[PDB]
Amino acid sequence: KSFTVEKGIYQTSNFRVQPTESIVRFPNITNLCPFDEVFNATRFASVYAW
């Protein structure tokens, strides 16, 4: 709070680094379905028999 300062040291503010991205590792490996296997069976059926 002046235009003239004397010699010495003067603390002004503080230095803080910043985060860059985010990391989320939820539980391992993962849970999964076998209904996708149905897709790779082969043949189907009748029309009154959907």
Partner: protein, 172 residues
């Protein structure tokens, strides 16, 4: 995050320590123990020789390994107090002008004007000649006059508790 060498027992997951700070975790996938530490911080300060003589400054970051992590000038230097940028570490020694810490003092001196930081010197090195039989008797003296300043008393003050707190309002 960083690698952890501390061995966990299988059931427990967290790594809390003295007080309430979390100190270690385990990977939710592949089950690997990790270590944590807060990323660096600190205060900044400005070393100046005054606006009367010049305008160059040399700032300082406290407790930051600037070799390990970049802060983002004239030069960079490592000190136990922190990292100093804007001055060069001259090898000679003089008296102290602006203290920094861990025996480092800076001043605005020529080699054509720049800010330098050196190592503190406690004074001129002197020796005496001790001997089995040697005395030195002075032959002339000097009547000196020093000075000394001492505070005695401060300024008397008094307050009015009702008037200050309540601005002449009967509700307050």
């Amino acid at each position: 995050l960083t690698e952890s060498n501390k061995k966990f027992l299988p059931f427990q997951q967290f790594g809390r320590d003295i007080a309430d700070t979390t100190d270690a975790v385990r990977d939710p996938q592949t089950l690997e123990i990790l270590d944590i530490t807060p990323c660096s911080f600190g205060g900044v300060s400005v070393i100046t020789p005054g606006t009367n003589t010049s305008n160059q400054v040399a700032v300082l970051y406290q407790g930051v390994n600037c070799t390990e992590v970049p802060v983002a000038g004239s030069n960079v230097f490592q000190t136990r107090a922190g990292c100093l940028i804007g001055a060069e570490y001259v090898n000679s020694s003089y008296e102290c002008d602006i203290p920094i810490g861990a025996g480092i003092c800076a001043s605005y001196q020529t080699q054509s004007q720049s800010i330098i930081a050196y190592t503190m010197s406690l004074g001129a090195e002197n020796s005496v000649a001790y001997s089995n039989n040697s005395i030195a008797i002075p032959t002339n003296f000097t009547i000196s006059v020093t000075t000394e300043i001492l505070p005695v008393s401060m300024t008397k003050t008094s307050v009015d508790c009702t008037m200050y707190i309540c601005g002449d309002s009967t509700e307050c």
